[PDB]
Amino acid sequence: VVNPLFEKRPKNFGIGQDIQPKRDLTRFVKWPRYIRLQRQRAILYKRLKVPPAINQFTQVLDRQTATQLLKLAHKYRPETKQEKKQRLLARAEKKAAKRPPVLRAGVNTVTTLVENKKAQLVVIAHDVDPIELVVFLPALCRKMGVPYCILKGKARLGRLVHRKTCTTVAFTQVNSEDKGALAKLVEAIRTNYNDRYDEIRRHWGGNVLGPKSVARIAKLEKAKAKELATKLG
């Protein structure tokens, strides 16, 4: 019932025997200089001995706690321009015929309300292009006793406010029904960051070799160790 003319002719992709197929070459592409630069910069970050003051941002909050924090933060979002206009219109007509607590954005605003311990929680983005903007903030919060946590993504941190990016968001006051959840989050954040600051400042980063260098060293030490211990006894 099968046509006998349907044979199979397999290609033999040997050396010098057949044309090499168009396979995946995603590793050997001569990438543009900007792509090359933004990749080897991350390589250099993993290579060089990153100081603890900078590497502290690499250690970040876990996923479940992060999304729980976002759920809490979604309650106190600031007013947009249109609804702020609506509020002003409502007050104007009400007068013709109390503000709730909200988030505290901006690094300058946050550090001013932290240095006088007027805030209960601080959330810091881990991906500021200059780290010098927020490098001192974890130490400042530790000395002032204000709980602080590090969150991955300034974009998702900046989506709490209705702008593009925001370095830091501060919780200064919460409503009664969210007081318990805020306190539960605060104690866990304090244990993660504030209570382990000595280890944080003692924890350097980077100083990791590449996979080829690790492999060659590992096989070298494996060969010498297996030729030493096994034969000796």
Binding site: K22, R23, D24, L25, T26, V29
Partner: protein, 118 residues
């Protein structure tokens, strides 16, 4: 999707056309090279008259910026006479002398004596 070629080239992007909020010039420039200024004056030399009386052609003095097609169309519109061919040269004085060979039906002698040159 995967990359086959080991080289990377700029992806082709979408580019739009000009939609200015105002025309750069208020009005298009008037055609200064019209059918009246393309031809200046026919020659009245004895050689020209000997040529019109033998080869059934005409001689004109025109500007240097006129093509043979433009001369043919201008003569056709100004005098309602079919043109067989045009031969143009630039005189040492600077003006362009154009020989306009007419179609066999028309007669150069009649055209010349009805446009003035005789």
């Amino acid at each position: 999707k995967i990359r086959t070629s080991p080289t990377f080239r700029r992806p082709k992007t979408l580019r739009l056309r000009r939609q200015p909020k105002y025309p750069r010039k208020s009005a298009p420039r008037r055609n200064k090279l019209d059918h009246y200024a393309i031809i200046k004056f026919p020659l009245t030399t004895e050689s020209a008259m000997k040529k019109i009386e033998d080869n059934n052609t005409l001689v004109f003095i025109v500007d240097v910026k006129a093509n043979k097609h433009q001369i043919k169309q201008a003569v056709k519109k100004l005098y309602d006479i079919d043109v067989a061919k045009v031969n143009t040269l630039i005189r040492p004085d600077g003006e362009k002398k154009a020989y306009v060979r007419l179609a066999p039906d028309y007669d150069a002698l009649d055209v010349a004596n009805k446009i003035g040159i005789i």
